[PDB]
Paper text:
The highly conserved coiled-coil domain-containing protein 61 (CCDC61, also known as variable flagellar number 3, VFL3) is one of these understudied proteins. Here, we identify CCDC61 as a highly conserved paralog of SAS6, a key organizer of the central scaffold around which centrioles are formed (Leidel et al., 2005). Our crystal structures of CCDC61 demonstrate that it adopts a SAS6-like fold and forms oligomers through two homodimerization domains in a similar way to SAS6: an N-terminal globular head and a parallel coiled-coil domain. Further analysis of CCDC61 reveals that its coiled-coil domains are capable of directly interacting with microtubules.
A filament model of zCCDC611−170 suggests that CCDC61 would be able to form protofilaments with a left-handed 3-fold screw axis along the filament, the helical rise of which is ∼80 Å. However, instead of the spiral/ring assemblies observed with SAS6, CCDC61 assembles into linear filaments with 3-fold, left-handed screw axes in vitro. To further confirm higher-order oligomer formation of zCCDC611−170 in solution, we subjected this construct, as well as its F129E/D130A mutant that disrupts the head-to-head interaction in zCCDC61, to size-exclusion chromatography with multi-angle light scattering analysis. Intriguingly, in the filaments formed by CCDC61 in vitro, the distance between the projecting coiled-coil domains of CCDC61 that point in the same direction is about 24 nm, which corresponds to three times the 8-nm repeat of tubulin dimers in microtubules.
Numbering used by the authors:
A (entry chain B), C (entry chain B): 2 to 100, 110 to 163
B (entry chain A), D (entry chain A): 3 to 96, 111 to 163
Write the structure that this text describes.
């Protein structure tokens, strides 16, 4: 963690997404992009949110460890952690079958950090709001910036 | 060859990204509304450009012409200036949905007591697929990291 | 678990001990014997004690899972769990240096169930009261029982 | 050979575990106080046993003698009975700490109009190392599981 940014492409249920995790001073940022449809979700989580979230699972983690787990899962560099991406409808079925949708919730995606060790099987859910498609202006506005820095060197 | 100029310029109350690029035997002119991200694009050959300049009265050779257009975009010459206007705006100076959309980049050349107007037709491309734009943003970001 | 009894010999810090774990209906029993000096400690723990004990560690386990972990550690059949045996003096130093003894506490041993997985490092402590040396009568009384059952078959 | 008898019996207000075992050319007698776990043990050869029985008056051959002692422990004969008493109790019928401790298993043989008293000296072993006893308990428990 400590200022670092990890971004990788990965396929969730037969679709390429761009995933960007960024650990900053007392804030974790997750950003996902549908690379085919350019749809986007983003989440911001504080150390309190995160730690209190893991406590709910009975399997606590401290904020830096969690971010480190997440980094590891994005990097696919650790067999004990894995990701998944779900919709609220999907999310209920895997907990409702175990035993009414607003605009913001309906488009929401849940990034599920999945922790598997010899005696625990834990799912840590990170809720990501639908952020819309981006503005093709600003993308171009921004591409015109990168083009010049590239030519500078 | 391959020389590229990119500059920002205003055309009748709006901001445009103008990119001109001279390949061998091909002039490429792209125009984007920096705000609405509307894009227009022309590709012109030597034969076309020389045929065009004569038609208007003051023929220039293709390299010389591109060169002027490069100066115009650098705003680095008095003899040349640019305008941008529609088939309606052009009609008055002298329509299908395609025509209603396309733009004309005018190279306004000054000599002696008169000004010559060189119209380049630039077709409409549409707005871009922002997916496509992000994939390309991803590529440029990886060029910078390694470098 | 569910009625089962596991007993094995194992060396803690250069001494052979006999360890006996027994999982019964809502009660876990741990019994340790110094095989050279015949000293003995025993502990009985309920599902509430155990579960509330794991919660304290931030890394919950349900009673049957914990007993199963413990069985696994005694059986040395799982790389993620290991045992250790400590005295209260030992126990403090590893937590006091990280930053007055009654009879019953002084002779007490702590069986430390040690859980190591990719992102957690947990020590689960089971306190065992010193039960004295056994009565050589009852041992003999009992050996005279086994001798006859053996000859019966 | 190898025949073993184990029975419980009372001797002057106390409970004892008596084990008698006839190997070839050796009689083994062990006695344990089932309560205090005090243990006494004798090992007697044929020559010793025959020399002993004559001394007392009514010689028996070694196999015959052991056999009687086995009957005595099974309490399965009228002619024989057992007692257990100390060098002090024995003196009266006719001391270093070792002697003060040791016991005598008496085989009381009845014939015609008299009773013959056969004393076997059984040394003190001490109480046992309960460590040792547990190690042995562990061994027997593993014999039973497999079987």
């Amino acid at each position: 963690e400590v200022g670092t940014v990890v971004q990788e492409e990965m396929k969730f249920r037969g679709s390429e997404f761009a995933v960007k995790v960024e650990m900053a001073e007392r804030l974790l940022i997750v950003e996902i992009s549908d690379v085919v449809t350019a749809d986007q979700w983003r989440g911001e989580f504080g150390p309190a949110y995160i730690e209190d979230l893991t406590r709910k699972t009975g399997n606590f983690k401290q904020f830096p460890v969690f971010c480190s787990m997440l980094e590891s899962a994005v990097h696919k560099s650790s067999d004990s952690v894995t990701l998944d991406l779900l919709t609220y409808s999907d999310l209920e079925l895997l907990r409702n079958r175990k035993a009414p949708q607003s605009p913001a919730l309906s488009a929401k995606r849940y990034l599920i950090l999945i922790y598997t060790v010899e005696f625990d099987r834990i799912h840590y859910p990170l809720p990501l709001p639908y952020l819309g498609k981006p503005d093709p202006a600003e993308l171009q506005k921004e591409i015109r910036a990168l083009r010049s820095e590239l030519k500078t060197l």
